[PDB]
Ligand binder design. Structure first.
Ligand SMILES: [Ca+2]
Ligand SMILES: [Cl-]
Ligand SMILES: [Cl-]
Ligand SMILES: [Mg+2]
Length: 662
């Protein structure tokens, strides 16, 4: 059986001639994915592996579009060809299942659909046989993070030959000798175990499902589908970025009117704890006090921020909070945090409190209190909550029905279901969720639009204490790996880079000041933190104006140019909402450790309109190690027929507001 993208460049062949059912993929008539197996092994049920033959193929197609309530673009186009291939094996130990493939111009998605059939009752998947066999893997280059490690998704990316990527998380991005870029991921991860990729024979990446502590991967009763497995394919790195395939493979919004989900910018009592000017726990340096929170709310009201995150407000942080998962209360504030007074103050100032539920990995202690915790926040005029699951890989703690503790993975079926329960319960309270230590993004924000963002990668916090901090190349890695999954709460915008001393050997963001501004356009998130202490913004009002101006919700986004681990340039048009007219464009560009010159056409600007470009760029002598603050801000009249030369310093960047003129 064969299905092709609408433009014909991607061709999938589904076969039953190999030991199992299999598929392969060509791009512009060159094989990029060799014969790759399909099937399942179960704990007790007979396997779905060899001796299955194709009995039926059903071809359909889609050419439609839909509108996002919020996002990186307003209108999402869905154009794909689709084939459902049915396989059957005669008795004994026979069975039937189908695989549905969707072929887009930008990539492929497929999933298994296992129907009701005799003997398929309570089953436990122990292995998914799905492969991604990369052709010519010996000359391919990959940019990847290890899976099943002690620090979850929070690793810097490795640059290696593809054959050295032994066990990796997704999105898993690489390029072949021809320059074709490919990224493997999944979409709509619901009631199933996350897929890790396990390189078997050279170039053959096998699905490796993250298991329960008992050892099985996925528990199902009867008929079941898998999540989508996705293979993005493009001739250029930015062709991976500019795809909507992940959203397009998710189910439509199930929450109805979600106008109560509000993109915007926020600040927080947060960074001070990471740089040790405050503590989460009680005492003379406690960050989460009534007085401190009102001070932040006053600043947010004056400078245009919607909310103030406050961590350390609830009892349980005293001591070493990493070990306090058993004792956190999610309803009882410390005596110096007056939540009723702050609720009144939020109504006076128009600035909301952003809630915080750190579990330190004990999800049963949280689940027990969750309904009361969200009821408190709904009563307290709280619309957004940051959650946390801080524990090493494989050390989620749950208490089972017999009162016995079990350790689980953050990305097993158990936690996949635990995260979605939290999001669905929050939605009943009109609360949106920002998940730190999350399951990776698989597009579920389409279906549940209150799941607004997540961490799930190294963000700004590692630049306070990472030892080492994130390297200069980190953003240009994230843009073509982590960010292919969806929005990230990176917490950009550190203006004081000197708190541990300058140079290349201290814990600090290893960037220039202008690169910190560029992050608001390079790294998409519907909520964007201005992460620094307020006084550090007051010290640099000219640079701070860009953060005050920049929106977080876009009617269109375009990655204009870039290369994995080297640089990225984004242009985005603001969505008409709140104070934003919908007429302004914004641009952000960042580089890695190298200074880089990038020529850009401005033909993304609307035809026939004049813009005033407000350009925030690295100064003449800027250099991230010892001269990161040199900054030039200039205004230039431009139209779509103009060009721009970006001159990025070492670990530098540029941020531009294109202000439409009336
Ligand atoms: Ca974290
Ligand atoms: Cl993580
Ligand atoms: Cl960084
Ligand atoms: Mg590089």
């Amino acid at each position: 059986a064969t299905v092709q993208s609408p433009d014909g460049n991607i061709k999938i062949i589904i076969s039953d001639e190999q030991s199992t059912p299999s598929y392969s993929i060509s791009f512009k008539n060159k094989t990029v994915i060799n014969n790759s197996a399909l099937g399942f092994e179960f704990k007790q049920h007979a396997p779905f592996s060899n001796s299955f033959k194709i009995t039926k193929v059903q071809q359909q197609s889609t050419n439609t579009q839909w509108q996002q309530p919020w996002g990186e673009r307003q209108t999402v186009v869905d154009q794909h060809n689709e084939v459902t291939v049915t396989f059957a094996k005669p008795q004994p130990q026979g069975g039937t299942y189908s695989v549905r493939f969707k072929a887009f111009d930008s990539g492929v998605g497929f999933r298994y659909e296992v129907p009701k059939q005799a003997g398929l009752n309570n089953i436990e998947i122990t292995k998914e046989l799905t492969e991604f066999a990369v052709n010519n893997s010996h000359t391919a280059t990959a940019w990847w993070i290890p899976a099943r490690g002690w620090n979850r998704y929070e690793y810097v990316y490795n640059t290696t030959p593809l054959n050295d990527a032994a066990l990796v998380h997704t999105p898993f991005t690489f390029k072949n000798q021809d320059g074709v870029h490919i990224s493997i991921h999944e979409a709509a991860l619901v009631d199933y175990a996350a897929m890790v990729l396990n390189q078997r024979r050279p170039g053959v990446f096998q699905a490796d499902l993250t298991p329960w502590s008992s050892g099985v991967a996925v528990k199902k009763q009867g008929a079941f589908n898998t999540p989508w497995r996705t293979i993005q394919i493009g001739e250029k790195a930015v062709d991976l970025v500019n795809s909507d395939i992940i959203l397009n493979l998710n189910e439509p919004n199930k929450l109805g009117d979600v106008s109560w989900v509000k993109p915007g910018k926020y600040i927080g009592i947060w960074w001070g704890m990471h740089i040790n000017t405050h503590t989460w726990g009680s005492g003379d340096k406690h960050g989460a006090t009534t007085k401190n929170t009102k001070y932040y709310m006053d600043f947010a009201a004056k400078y245009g921020f919607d909310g103030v995150l406050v961590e350390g407000w609830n009892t349980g942080w005293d001591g070493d909070w990493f070990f306090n998962g058993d004792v956190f209360s999610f309803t009882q504030p410390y005596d110096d945090f007056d939540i009723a007074a702050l609720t009144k103050y939020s109504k006076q100032t128009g600035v909301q409190l952003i809630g915080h539920h750190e579990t330190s990995g004990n999800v049963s202690n949280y689940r027990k209190q969750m309904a009361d915790a969200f009821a408190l926040y709904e009563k307290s005029n709280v619309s957004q909550v940051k959650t946390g699951y801080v524990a090493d890989g494989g050390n989620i703690k749950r208490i089972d029905k017999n009162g016995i503790a079990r350790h689980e993975w953050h990305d097993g079926q158990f936690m996949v279901n635990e995260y979605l329960h939290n999001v669905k319960l929050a939605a009943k309270h009109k609360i949106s969720i920002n998940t730190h230590e999350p399951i990776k993004d698989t597009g579920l924000r389409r279906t549940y639009p209150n799941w607004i963002t997540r961490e799930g990668a190294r963000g700004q916090q590692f630049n306070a204490w990472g030892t080492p901090p994130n390297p200069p190349e980190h953003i240009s890695m994230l843009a073509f790996t982590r960010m292919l999954a969806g929005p990230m709460d990176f917490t950009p915008g550190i203006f004081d880079l000197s708190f541990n001393g300058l140079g290349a050997n201290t814990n600090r963001p290893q960037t220039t000041l202008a690169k910190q501004l560029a992050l608001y356009v390079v790294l998409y998130s519907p909520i964007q933190m201005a992460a620094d202490l307020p006084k550090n913004y007051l010290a640099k009002p000219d640079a701070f104006q860009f953060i005050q101006d920049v929106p977080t919700d876009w009617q269109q986004s375009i990655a204009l140019d870039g290369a994995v681990g080297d640089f990225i340039v984004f242009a985005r048009k603001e969505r008409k909402r709140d104070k934003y007219t919908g007429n302004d464009w914004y641009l952000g560009a960042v580089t890695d450790e190298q200074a880089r010159t990038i020529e850009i056409s401005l033909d993304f600007l609307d035809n026939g309109k004049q813009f005033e470009a407000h350009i925030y760029k690295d100064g003449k002598n800027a250099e991230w190690k010892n001269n990161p603050y040199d900054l030039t801000i200039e205004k230039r009249l431009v139209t779509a027929s103009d060009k721009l030369t970006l001159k990025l310093a070492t670990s530098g960047g540029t941020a531009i507001r294109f202000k439409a003129l009336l």
